[PDB]
């Protein structure tokens, strides 16, 4: 529409995250005009290659490698401002040049203070212990951060931009409070807000009003806005498998809350989904395979925590989970990776429905007690058995990967725009 | 969209609340098959009359009025259980049958327990006292249970259907927690657990899955679907005048996150915007009139507490936030309420720009010292000094009135459908 204006592009997590999003974002923000984050997620890190040179995003938008475009930091981001200089400095001697240069971080984003990440680090402990339930609350400090966002006790960009008096009194009641609920958080103010008057300077170049860049942004001349999807689906806060989880809305919704523009600015929504099922940490997983078929997938895959090593859980497609995501999300086209994975089998099982005692339900079960109850009800489908790594069109995949694609695509309601069978650009097919 | 099912459609506030968006909702609420929240927000009530009974709306979606249509609560909502079911008896024993015969809670929506309230009524005091900065923390505990979700160490209604004893087992880690962090924090464990189990049973038949809910609501055959938002822009978590805000999202997004639902199932979004600008406590206000214009404003308007008496603070018509909450929301149309009001002034005074230090500002200032510091730009437009209570029509209102209505309506660029003369249905005259 002429009044709407430019309709912005997002690419999500379709299932548990790992989908490989990263290769469908590298693939759109080499002809975009803006790149960025909306909501922060496990903060989980992307890695890019350009030119020999590998660099590793984590806070950063990853299209910031494209020079010719603008990188952005939404308002429901936390940063950490340690941690985002860090994380440019690091990539600056890497080859990154000039990045302070394209990147813009909204004034509404809110900051994870040093001592937001010490409770953090010290939650998980007295939260587990023994033996507990280890969620695996990710110590980069992102829920104690976002409690004090709720709290409305918290600060952000804006503020350390301001008055600094005001400020650092600020810093100081929120910290006395902390200490407060945790007796045992050592903190050092009078250090740490040294350190943030010097991050206020080193940041206010690139700071901006970021509803306003958003709505001149899509409401001057046509432009190409891009949006990196948090994590997936069945981590979002409120949608995902509860608790085990983050605290990040990672769906659509949050695109609006977490950019500051209607729905009627937002257009193409990629759901990413890989060609099976993984999983990290404790929980749930209906189609789970812990046998030789599992071993394969995980083998297969490379399915691996990138800087731990622990293996993640694999099994069968889920299209109950898959819906799920749907019914949230809206996808307007798929991408579909790792297909190459299962080139091997000679049969593949997806699951296509839950019952959970006895009775077919239709709807994704919230609550991990009914959610670990319910058995998958299967479809199994032949397997190409072919190498499929070299396929470059819709044409070179053989019959029964079309079949797979199909089926996916019809279960779901959804088309697929692109199959992964490999890591390259040139393996991620275009259908349409 | 054949394919995109039924678009929902949004009341909002534009301000800062108190814009009489209920006498839209009301409107509205009569030929809906569905009314619905998404979000708790201040959890401020409603008052509608239906023959001479007068209902009190808190939690409950104000459209319950209709017995025809169905009341759904969304995932996005943090619900008291014995604030709910009080809330609802009190109402049936007004005239209100039948209500848990049409009323449905999404099991994905988090629980507001009493300790939640406690430690509330507990924050406002030592993060107060002597002389601090009192936001006034609604001590209805809506922001201690919005950082569990954070800290995913809350529960939701799921939680408390499923298995009672990891349930109960769980609340008691919640408590302790909570005990850890705030030692004056009384609770008594075993006599809310056995309360709680009591609830249980008495909400089971009403919860459901909410995702599923809404899907097939609008993928199903036509349906109307309203959702009221919950309080104004400016006191929305994100975009609202921080920390003076809620701990929800009340913007267009909270409508994804708070139901489960696409962008693309979204239609109109109204946006409630009251002739002249209201609001309430600490904080900077713009255009507020320490005078005798704001005294009339005040007297005119009835803008006080309804609970407490105290009087609102009131000012000039704002563009600068106007618009600013079009950015974030979208309007498709707008609800000009109290406009009678100004019957009696000669001439009205609008601010249609900020200038911050000489210059002239594009947005929003998102910090408090910003914002208090910018001066308003004004434009005094003349009065219509006539009374309009009796309009009915576009044709009745006078030319100084129709005058004030198009410049809103340029200004902002969103057309006006309703113009709002008094407190009768009647009195909100529809322009198309």
Known sequence: AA????????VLGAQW????????????????????????GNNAGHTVVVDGKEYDFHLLPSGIINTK???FIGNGVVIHLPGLFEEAEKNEKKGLKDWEKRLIISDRAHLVFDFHQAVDGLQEVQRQAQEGKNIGTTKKGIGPTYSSKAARTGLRICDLLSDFDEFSARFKNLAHQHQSMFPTLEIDVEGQLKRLKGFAERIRPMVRDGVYFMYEALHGPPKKVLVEGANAALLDIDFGTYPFVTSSNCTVGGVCTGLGIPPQNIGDVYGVVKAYTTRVGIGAFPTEQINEIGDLLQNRGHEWGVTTGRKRRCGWLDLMILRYAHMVNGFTALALTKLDILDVLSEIKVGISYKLNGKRIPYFPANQEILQKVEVEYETLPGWKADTTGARKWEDLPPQAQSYVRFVENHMGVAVKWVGVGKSRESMIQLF
Request: charged content about 25%; proline content about 0%.
């Open 3 to 10: 009044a709407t204006g430019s309709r912005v592009t997002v």
């Open 17 to 40: 995250g790992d989908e490989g999003k990263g290769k469908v974002v590298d693939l759109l923000a080499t002809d975009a005009d803006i790149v960025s984050r909306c909501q922060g």
């Open 69 to 71: 475009a603008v990188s």
